Design a protein around this ligand. Structure first.
Ligand SMILES: Nc1ncnc2c1ncn2[C@@H]1O[C@H](CSCC[C@H](N)C(=O)O)[C@@H](O)[C@H]1O
Ligand SMILES: Nc1ncnc2c1ncn2[C@@H]1O[C@H](CSCC[C@H](N)C(=O)O)[C@@H](O)[C@H]1O
Ligand SMILES: O=Cc1ccc(O)c(O)c1
Ligand SMILES: [Mg+2]
Ligand SMILES: [Mg+2]
Lengths: 242, 242
């Protein structure tokens, strides 16, 4: 109710990691990520680390992996659901060719305005069409308008976790055959490995349950082939088969 | 030569994981890997788990990830360095198109013949050209005979770890521009994070130092873009730039 509002300090999982030690994750970042990170990504990350919802920021080693996937598959048209301050969005815009196009959807444009100066300085603002809205109505409107020529090569899903299965039903129609759908956070701080987990915030527990259900659904879905990858907070790559 | 024993039982790191949770790795395998694993890959994995060098076997979640990369980049011609019983090789042969081709190099064909019945039953043996040799002389012969139109789309490097830097100098000329080179085990049980790590077999220590050097070299190499991925025992994806 009324008060000071939602803080990430009310959450139990902030300080959890899936790798063996903090030293191993720090090694990966210092050795293989920061030397390869665009200066505008570094600036965007450093401001976002000070923000009240910094827990949501995509892991930087995951960012470089998404960039690699976009280049290897020659993606040109992508969709991002869940923008926050724009780290994965700027990563994507830097990876695409000059004529690449991104549809970016987030309910809160004020977060996006934090990252927008870095996107402009990087010279890739022209690739981004940002839409301030809940994603589900936008996706349903796309399904009535988009033709086969406009299908996306790649979707990154990093928004409200309990809605992922709902996003999946739209995205298997909005991404081309042979295209990729990537779901962030599918290992949810390691909590998915347990049928019950003590002391979580109600929203954290709702996400543990939803990801356990989502991971089973994706593994059984004949419309896609999958790979769940223990990078960052876990991601699942889906490739559309038909 | 004469010296100390260097069998698998002589190594210290066999059971060490890069993920901090054994339950999380089992969850990934049981939820997202085994339901998606080809029957012949399952049989090959089960035999190899009993073999005296079972620690060398590529992780099954990494297998599905490699398959996903190959499909998303539409690879058609690949090279594998380090075959063992053939798990990554069968993964690759199953992922490629019907007319895809693999050049597979290993010093020990007897290992390959353990997995060969599974590869034959999968119906993809015809894609594989197995070469029984040390890899370095083969790659140098390829540099002499390779034409630009025959460059590989994808290379998987999983053989003798101290030689990876030597392999890299040939493979950046044998893979096409825009192609991928994947180096397996670049986190080496997490020991790369530390300048010193007590209690290692001398060959394990040699690989720790070798990978610390390689990870620095790859992060600084302008010929490639990289992404180090904390799946399996760690891998590094390189994409050739010029
Ligand atoms: N229903 C909804 N539709 C669209 N965006 C939503 C949403 N519910 C939450 N979000 C947004 O999802 C985002 C999750 S954080 C996303 C992180 C970002 N991709 C990065 O690279 O760091 C938040 O910005 C939140 O505002
Ligand atoms: N110099 C060399 N040239 C080619 N192969 C070598 C080599 N030194 C060692 N090897 C081979 O490298 C292999 C490493 S284990 C390879 C694992 C396999 N790719 C999998 O999917 O499980 C062993 O089979 C070993 O015989
Ligand atoms: O909302 C919490 C949150 C936490 C971690 C994430 O990666 C994310 O996208 C969201
Ligand atoms: Mg996320
Ligand atoms: Mg290996």
């Amino acid at each position: 109710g009324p008060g000071m509002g939602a803080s990430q300090d009310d959450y139990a999982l902030i300080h959890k990691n899936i790798l063996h030690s903090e030293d191993l994750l720090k090694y990966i970042l210092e050795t293989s990520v920061y030397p390869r990170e665009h200066e505008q990504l570094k600036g965007l990350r450093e401001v976002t680390e000070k923000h009240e919802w910094s827990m949501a920021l995509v892991a930087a080693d995951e960012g470089l992996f998404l960039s690699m996937l976009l280049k290897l598959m020659n993606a040109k048209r992508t969709i991002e659901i869940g923008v926050y301050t724009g780290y994965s969005l700027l990563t994507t815009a830097l990876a695409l060719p000059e004529d690449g196009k991104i549809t970016a959807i987030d309910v809160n444009k004020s977060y996006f305005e934090i990252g927008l100066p870095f996107i402009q300085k990087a010279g890739v603002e022209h690739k981004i069409n940002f839409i301030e809205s809940e994603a589900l109505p936008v996706l349903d409107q796309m399904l009535q308008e988009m033709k086969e020529e406009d299908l996306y090569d790649f979707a990154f899903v990093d928004a409200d976790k309990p809605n992922y299965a709902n996003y999946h039903e739209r995205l298997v129609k909005l991404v081309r055959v042979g295209g990729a759908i990537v779901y962030d956070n599918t290992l949810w701080f390691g909590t998915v490995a347990f049928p019950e987990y003590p002391g979580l915030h109600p929203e954290e527990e709702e996400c543990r349950v939803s990801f356990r259900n989502l991971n089973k659904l994706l593994a059984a879905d004949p419309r896609v082939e999958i790979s769940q990858v223990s990078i960052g907070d876990g991601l699942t790559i889906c490739r559309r088969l038909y």
